[PDB]
């Protein structure tokens, strides 16, 4: 039987790593892309389809689920895995990021955040409890994602609060025997774009001790150049022997560059959200299938993609479906986009394992941006 | 290799029949339920899923497809079968019924109907041509579905026009060698609720000669009692050795009673349309999954249904999905409802084959309306 949590690194190239996370509910191949759910579902896909694309783990949506149908109700029905029919690992975010981005009126304090549903409270203790009620396998500490840009003073005060909340998250998780024995807990580094604050945050998280370490506070408007600059110094501050999770990233080129900088795990709504809006990812860059140039194009979305959509249906058909507002259009676009992301991760893993990831990154960028 | 068209009756009980239609693209078990597409898709289902529910044939949507993406374009892309990925028989309606129900401004004449898209003309010749361009296997004659109620004079004039159009449909179909050799053509009986007009229409259609005969002009507001009364005298007027197709019907109890009256084929948007709106069919009658009573119900939609939805997911989960507006909710409701309809048809076929259909009908009604 698998352990509660074990991360093993099988091969390395520069800062990039490939390996596996073993958990009770399954193995996660890294670098990993984790598709993101909306309301106990990955949009427009059955769980068997999500698995068929190559996903080893998905994200649940703590913020949506605590409001509807409610975390207690999901627990009463047997937990999120049973409820939605996904029996493999699930990671849950801690909810505050989405509260601060989506909620109408927020009130923040040392205790947590109160907010009005689009009233509810969210504290480190309540966040960990909700994630337990959902039955999450990878639990995120409750943090504050500092807005960008932030002054050094405000970034420091925010990061300091997040580190106090990280300790409260650790203690809440450890107090609950079933959660501590069966799930894993990740800490989230903050500190905005400032190296000294990123270092203080990394040091605080390592002193507490976590199963994995996320880089928080990025993909919040700073742009790729700045994100990469912050990753350059921030990832080496985290424990080398634990997974590194870049939250909310990102486009294919963001993922490649982040792996070059030591990131092992990614989540992003982009492939699911933008597929419904007509954007399809291809090795030659994204296309918008709604464009009239595809109305009679009999080729698949991408000429090399191995997914079931590209084996069966044409650009012309999917163009028509999306233009007509048909549900099958969203289903096919979403399956292809998630499958494309998984094929990207597989090429990344294979190229690191073979010591040719730097060349893969160069070749990928030349063709994707040609 | 299968013939162009062969209908064989394997067993009979009273007016009910069970058997098969063999066509080049597959066998159709009768009595048959034919799921209805919207715009080159059966809503929210891949074709493989439609087939998995038990469907042997589906309906294309001539009215929608002639407007978008256009019949000529579909032909240029290889036909509707290739375009949507369904390789089995497709029946297409002739388009006038939907024009008269959906179009904003209509102008009717002996030549056909002109209308504005929500300008285009539709005549017997153009209707048959569009169905050819789509690559339909079962082509419907171009008719006029008389509004209900209709005076005897107006019903007669309308039926007479439909019979002239039926002859024009026959000749257009026969002129096109590839269509005549590979597809089948059905005539449509009209005459409103009037026995003498139904008889004149049946006689006119039999003189022309068709591969199958539809009962048109019903399910247009007359209610089940009146529909059944008209079927009682109308179905025996059609050739016994050809299939009898009741257009646009219907609810499960409508289907059972129509089979008792000699109907072999059915199409209806109800299972697809109403599933998206939360109505699920069960052997104990329909339920609305949005009702709060299902919020914590761990049972499947129906306790006996063999479909994949009822094997995996609970009422509580589907309730949540539909309340949340999630695409997966529509997917699961639609798959279950179409599968339920196919299981109904299978029970009908098996009970006729075993000489116990009358008992099945009685048992079905007692439980469905309990
Ligand atoms: C898109 N950019 C971005 N996302 C971030 C996220 C959310 C990652 N995605 C989670 C899913 C969203 C819907 C359900 C869960 C962040 N989350 C936390 N806790 N902290 C961040 O600093 C944090 C930072 C992030 N930046
Ligand atoms: C719902 N009631 C009803 N439908 C009838 C229909 C349409 C059957 N359904 C076809 C699908 C609808 C969307 C795409 C094809 C009828 N069609 C014709 N041609 N004539 C009728 O008298 C006729 C009569 C009908 N009565
Ligand atoms: Cl969340
Ligand atoms: Cl039509
Ligand atoms: Zn693909
Ligand atoms: Zn079912």
Swiss-Prot record, chains A, B:
One of its GO terms (biological process) is tRNA wobble guanine modification. The keyword tRNA-binding does not apply. Its cofactor is Zn(2+). Signal peptide: none annotated. Gene3D superfamilies: Queuine tRNA-ribosyltransferase-like (3.20.20.105). The active site is at residues 93, 267. It holds the Pfam family TGT. InterPro entries: ArchSynthase1/Queuine_TRR, TGT, TGT-like_sf, tRNA_ribo_trans-like. Keywords: Glycosyltransferase, Metal-binding, Queuosine biosynthesis, Transferase, tRNA processing, Zinc. One of its GO terms (cellular component) is cytosol. The keyword Metal-binding applies. Pathway: tRNA modification; tRNA-queuosine biosynthesis. It catalyses: 7-aminomethyl-7-carbaguanine + guanosine(34) in tRNA = 7-aminomethyl-7-carbaguanosine(34) in tRNA + guanine. GO terms for molecular function: metal ion binding; tRNA-guanosine(34) queuine transglycosylase activity. Substrate binds at residues 93-97, 143, 190, 217. Zn(2+) binds at residues 305, 307, 310, 336. Residues 248-254, 272-276 are annotated as: RNA binding. Binds 1 zinc ion per subunit. PANTHER family: QUEUINE TRNA-RIBOSYLTRANSFERASE (PTHR46499:SF1). Homodimer. Within each dimer, one monomer is responsible for RNA recognition and catalysis, while the other monomer binds to the replacement base PreQ1. Belongs to the queuine tRNA-ribosyltransferase family. Catalyzes the base-exchange of a guanine (G) residue with the queuine precursor 7-aminomethyl-7-deazaguanine (PreQ1) at position 34 (anticodon wobble position) in tRNAs with GU(N) anticodons (tRNA-Asp, -Asn, -His and -Tyr). Catalysis occurs through a double-displacement mechanism. The nucleophile active site attacks the C1' of nucleotide 34 to detach the guanine base from the RNA, forming a covalent enzyme-RNA intermediate. The proton acceptor active site deprotonates the incoming PreQ1, allowing a nucleophilic attack on the C1' of the ribose to form the product. This is Queuine tRNA-ribosyltransferase. The gene is tgt.
